Amino acid sequence: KPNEIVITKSKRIEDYVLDTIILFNQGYEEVEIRGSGQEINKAIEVYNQLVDRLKEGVRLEKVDIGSERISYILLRLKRIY
Amino acid sequence: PNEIVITKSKRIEDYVLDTIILFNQGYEEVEIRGSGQEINKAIEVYNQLVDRLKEGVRLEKVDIGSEVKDRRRISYILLRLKR
Numbered sequence: 161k162p163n164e165i166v167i168t169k170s171k172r173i174e175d176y177v178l179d180t181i182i183l184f185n186q187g188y189e190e191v192e193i194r195g196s197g198q199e200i201n202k203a204i205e206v207y208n209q210l211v212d213r214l215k216e217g218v219r220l221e222k223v224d225i226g227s228e229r230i231s232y233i234l235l236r237l238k239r240i241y
Numbered sequence: 242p243n244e245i246v247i248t249k250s251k252r253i254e255d256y257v258l259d260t261i262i263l264f265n266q267g268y269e270e271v272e273i274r275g276s277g278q279e280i281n282k283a284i285e286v287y288n289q290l291v292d293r294l295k296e297g298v299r300l301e302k303v304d305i306g307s308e309v310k311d312r313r314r315i316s317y318i319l320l321r322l323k324r
Binding site: 198200205208225226 | 277
């Protein structure tokens with residue numbers, strides 16, 4: 161659960177990127193990022209900024225989409241050393 | 242033609258109608274692309290196709306990323322749906 165992030169309106173994209181890299185740095189090899197509704201685009205932009213930084217060092221392990229009546233996306237990312 | 246790009250003008254139900262008609266016309270797989278704001282919209286099109294077609298439609302592939310469109314950087318989602 162500490163490597164499970166929910167994207168909300170509260171923080172900037174860049175804050176969630178830093179949150180994710182800190183979790184990776186702390187030894188969680190995988191982090192889940194969840195976004196729903198208007199924050200699906202935000203979650204994808206968090207992923208894009210992570211890839212921009214880490215390149216091969218991060219891998220998109222799994223993408224789930226669905227409804228929970230609002231849409232959601234769930235991304236599983238893996239740090240690779 | 243079976244490569245749909247979601248915009249702000251059309252409603253979700255028109256894209257749903259669009260996809261089902263492509264399915265019946267012989268396009269077994271339809272691609273739905275949404276960028277930036279319309280990522281959430283594209284997923285909603287998918288969810289309604291599921292809500293009406295149930296197991297008659299399968300999510301084959303989901304791509305996410307960023308790219309440059311009309312010289313602005315945008316996030317995108319690409320959904321490939323199979324009938």
